[PDB]
Design a protein around this ligand. Structure first.
Ligand SMILES: [Zn+2]
Ligand SMILES: [Zn+2]
Ligand SMILES: [Zn+2]
Lengths: 681, 662
């Protein structure tokens, strides 16, 4: 029976949903932000699917797996081992490059060991043999950037230098040059009788190289540090690795593969996915992308709204069935019932109020000078990896924070920045998590927790118990649980699989001892008002106007489903970005202040995008300058000023392909973004 | 394509063989013992599959997987998740019962919690068998006990109906709605346990109170209960320790597992398994250097038509093991009879053993035949004939015992737990070879003593491996493995000792070289010639002379002990005890070992052996059947006498199978 049949998912907001899906099909999960799509996708399905097989690895593995909490499920049928790919894995290992994680570099070491003598364990910078002494293999002037020892950089296939620019293939930036060199120039160097001994090696190499080419990663160097890799890039090289693995029948759960992906690469990505299912695998992807939804064999919609309203199932069937189903906001958006109108009136670009950066020579950027209107919604486009985030984050944000906020951070290579007197302060709405500990949470982060604790101290139960606001603070020893030390959870080292939390055993996750919870304000204790969400907190804290100011903004930004007592690590990057944005909304919007956005459309439904654009429109209407980097066509057609980068990524590109209003960008044919925009505008 | 493809398999015996097999089919490896069946199957396909799929685990996994040696294979594709069920893993876990391993125990705990807390029902929690939990009753039968009566005493069938079907009609609507799925899972798992023919045993029996085959059967029952699709399963002679009646039932279980969506590869000498095999692959003729090839690859009929396959000849009728037309006379006066064997399930029966004759022990598995034969008989015989002080099983006494000189217990246990022991060390030729090497011009001009050439003596052995030839590096998630020492490259010696050459041969050279070629090599040396002749006769020629003890199978170790005791004067009377020597032996191997045993008994000696192989039984002149079933139901003599005596008796299942031959 080639069908996956499940019953009784109840993870967070799931009312025991029962599902049945055909095997070896393109399954897409969709819903509003926080509708539980991630729940079904990962927690209910992949956890069980992986763990069932991981038990079979050994008897000892079952013992090490028994300590975690099995998902709240009724029954599952037709299960097979599954592999998940996500952006959560962003290693910042100093001795890690692209070649190390791909493990392709070690294979080139093997090839140079055999062909060409040469041997591995001496080319590897992770070991002192290949580690240059002045940098410990990290990459110091003595090593001349190339982390390997100079002798290793010198030895070759009887030539001049397989090093000082990578080993003739690593620091080689574009994978096109690497592939051409290794496949043709290096292959023919061997002697009369080496075909039968190295052709299989070359075939193993170039197949993997073609795999990296297919996923659209033909630009970045193999010697780039892993810290310089985004979450989307990590998801991409993971996808390439699993494509090259060659296993058949494994399930795969994906979380928006098109993150940070230019509009041009969508069809190529779809092509790379389709052949994987043609092998005999099955794909389940959470997406808001129209094309992938159209090409998907099956679509499973999820309960309307998020949180309590979400967690249901709206649709389960073909794309036409989803379009017929009117209960799906996604279906309405796709079939045309819902859309976002292009603003007929665009904010006028001010030639005088014009920020400009000159001579940005950092990395692949060719010292280009770009001007940005002030007080007008402006967007930055361009193909993936063209360094569009590079100049912005390294140079512009750093300089603006140095000169306006007084921050001490080193900017990238550039000459200088014009003006800047037209704005008051820098706003950097990053996508990094709010906090790295369960102690940090939206209540403490936004400071509302202080107001709640002070109000709690001003209650009858607290004043008769002599409980200070600190007694209601899980962060301090006062009132917190003696086992969870206020976290409410205990982190457990899990040896090979990614690390997981377990709930506290004394307070059962209350973050407090039972004595502190005896206080009640409006019938809610500290914990009771803690786990109760912001959307239902809006009506609960209406009398407290000061606290109401925060929750109003968190409601406006569309985060009703989120929990105040939800730990910061459990919050996604986009959710943390929204938390920072709404906290900034809990301020006095000056007439002039620059707002910086980094792909805010992450993990948002079309209605969520329409909600957030309404929020940001008011902010721009304050005369404030807003800048955002995006690949979504709707925000491109909505913004009044758009500047395209490229036309290539990495070393190729780094120049201004086009700029101007959406009409201006669509007029330019050299801009791929303009090519996709002309179809709409 | 749904076809496994293999190229360039060279590890150990393999001579760069290339394979191509269908997927989701039952394929059986066959050949002579040591032809390369176990090596080729496990070491290449299972190792490759498991290693490759563990590479798809996490970043921390790969760095710890790169340490072990990659297989000597070129080009294999069509790979799928790997699971092996073998008899190697004999866990000693004191707090592990049958139910816990098969995970049904958790289901019973949950069911009794919902119909009485499952954690309070287990012995691994401070809440919980303690007497207070025994007060909880689910009276599906007249008796309601959470394992106190169900798991403790009544075996698979009885616990099954009493706690799954009797209470299936005494369950209230709330208990039904709350635990029906759990009870149904219990029923399905118990049915699977019934199918594999493990019905005889109770489920509270200790984990350690099992054989390797019993542990293997628990393992494959767990694999049945896992419910995964698309995983190939490799089996290592599951028919061991299993009655021929259960053979077809086990075949049914494997066929249902394959129909579930899996593929199966089994190395077996069983005729029934070969006949039931969808595909059969034969391996190069002979063992050792002679093997390592491919003879047949196709249907069973193709193997029959293949005249180059010894297994093909045996199955086609060209080769067979013939019943001895003349049997040794049973002497009623020479008769050793135990009395009152109350140990385990044995119901105090008295069993008479004829002397100066070939006798085999039969009966369905688990009926305590091993219990009696080892615990009572072997311990008593070692106490009185060898003087060893070991406690025998519960019995009264044994008649006679004055008709034999000493006990010869040939156990299947491995020769040694460490590479410190090799065949040369065990058989004693290591002293002779060391003295011979010291008696050379190179050794005497180097001032080298016999101990210099020893790997257990510091002088001469490698300073890193101390003569082991390998270094152990711990494996975190997978079982620990050995990687050879790089200082000596596994030579177990420093290079300063390897310059000595007797007949132009160094210590490591003659160590690696097998006894098969050592037979002609040490022909002038008659003293070592007797030893090598005994190994050749027993059938260990293809084994490496210096092969480490851990790299030796149980049957090979038993054969090594048999040859070592064959390096002795076979008296007119001495008892030999055997424990299923058929393990890992082709029909021709069975025939030659039968010739060896016939020669041994022809010295007037008395030999006893436990077996399920019909050829061994039919050759045996005297047979005594145990039964009627295994476990507590059983432990009584169903029949005894000549092969015709047992075959005539229909109550004897072994007699039922023998009546077909006789
Ligand atoms: Zn250096
Ligand atoms: Zn706690
Ligand atoms: Zn060594």
């Amino acid at each position: 029976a080639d069908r996956l049949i499940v019953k009784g998912a109840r993870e967070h907001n799931l009312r025991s949903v029962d599902l049945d899906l055909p095997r070896d099909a393109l399954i897409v999960f969709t819903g509003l932000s926080g509708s539980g799509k991630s729940s079904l996708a990962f927690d209910t399905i992949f956890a069980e699917g992986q763990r069932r097989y991981v038990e079979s690895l050994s008897a000892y593995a079952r013992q090490f797996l028994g300590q975690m909490d099995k998902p709240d499920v009724d029954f599952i049928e037709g299960l097979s081992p599954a592999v998940s790919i996500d952006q959560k894995s962003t290693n910042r290992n100093p001795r890690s490059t692209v070649g190390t994680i791909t493990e392709v570099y070690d294979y080139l070491r093997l090839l140079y060991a055999r062909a060409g003598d040469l041997e591995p364990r001496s080319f590897s910078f992770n070991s002192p043999y290949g580690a240059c002494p002045e940098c410990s293999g990290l990459g110091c002037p003595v090593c001349a950037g190339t982390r390997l020892k100079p002798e290793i950089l010198a030895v070759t296939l009887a030539g001049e230098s397989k090093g000082e620019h990578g080993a003739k293939s690593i620091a080689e930036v574009c994978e096109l040059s690497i592939a051409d060199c290794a496949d043709f120039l290096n292959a023919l160097t061997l002697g009369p009788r080496e075909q039968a001994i190295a052709g299989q090696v070359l075939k193993e190499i170039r197949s993997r190289l073609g795999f990296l080419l297919d996923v659209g990663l033909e630009y970045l160097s193999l010697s780039r540090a892993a810290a310089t890799l985004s979450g989307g890039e990590a998801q991409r090289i993971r996808l390439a690795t699993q494509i090259g693995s060659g296993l058949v029948g494994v399930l795969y759960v994906l979380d928006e593969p098109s993150i940070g992906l230019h509009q041009r690469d969508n069809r190529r990505l779809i092509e790379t996915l389709t052949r994987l299912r043609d092998l005999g695998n099955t794909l389940i992807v959470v997406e808001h992308d129209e094309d992938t939804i159209e090409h998907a064999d099956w679509i499973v919609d999820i309960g309307p709204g998020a949180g309590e309203h979400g967690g249901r199932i709206v649709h389960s069937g073909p794309y036409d069935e989803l379009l017929r189903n009117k209960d799906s906001i996604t279906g309405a958006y796709l079939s045309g019932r819902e859309s976002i109108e292009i603003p007929a009136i665009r904010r006028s670009v001010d030639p005088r109020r014009q920020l400009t950066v000159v001579g940005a020579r950092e990395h692949n950027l060719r010292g280009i000078d770009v001007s940005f209107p002030l007080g007008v919604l402006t967007s930055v486009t361009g193909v993936s990896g063209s360094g569009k985030s590079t100049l912005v984050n390294d140079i512009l944000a750093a300089v603006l924070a140095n000169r306006l906020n007084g921050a001490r951070q080193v900017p990238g290579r550039h000459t200088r920045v014009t003006g800047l007197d037209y704005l008051d302060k820098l706003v950097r709405v990053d996508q990094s998590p709010i906090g790295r500990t369960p102690r940090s949470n939206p209540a403490t982060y936004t400071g509302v927790f202080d107001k709640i604790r002070t109000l709690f101290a001003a209650t009858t139960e607290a004043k008769v118990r002599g409980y200070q606001p600190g007694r209601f603070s899980f962060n301090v020893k006062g009132g917190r649980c003696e086992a969870c030390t206020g976290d409410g959870t205990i982190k457990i080292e899990m040896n090979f699989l990614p690390d997981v939390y377990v709930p506290c055993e004394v307070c059962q996750g209350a973050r407090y001892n039972r004595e502190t919870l005896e206080v009640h304000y409006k019938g809610k204790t500290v914990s009771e008002v803690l786990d109760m969400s912001i959307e239902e907190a809006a009506e609960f804290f209406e009398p407290i106007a000061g606290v109401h100011r925060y929750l109003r903004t968190l409601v406006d930004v569309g985060l009703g489903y989120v929990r105040l007592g939800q730990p910061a690590p459990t919050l996604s990057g986009g959710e943390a970005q929204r938390v920072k944005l709404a906290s900034e909304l809990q301020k006095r919007s000056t007439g002039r202040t620059v707002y910086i956005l980094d792909e805010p459309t992450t993990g948002l439904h079309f209605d969520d995008i329409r909600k957030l654009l309404n929020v940001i429109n008011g902010l721009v209407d304050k005369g404030n300058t807003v800048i955002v980097i995006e690949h979504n066509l709707d925000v491109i057609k909505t913004s009044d000023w758009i500047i395209d980068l490229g036309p290539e990524g990495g070393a190729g590109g780094g120049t201004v392909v086009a700029q101007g209003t959406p009409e201006d960008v669509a007029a330019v044919p050299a801009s791929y973004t303009g090519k996709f925009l002309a179809e709409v505008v």
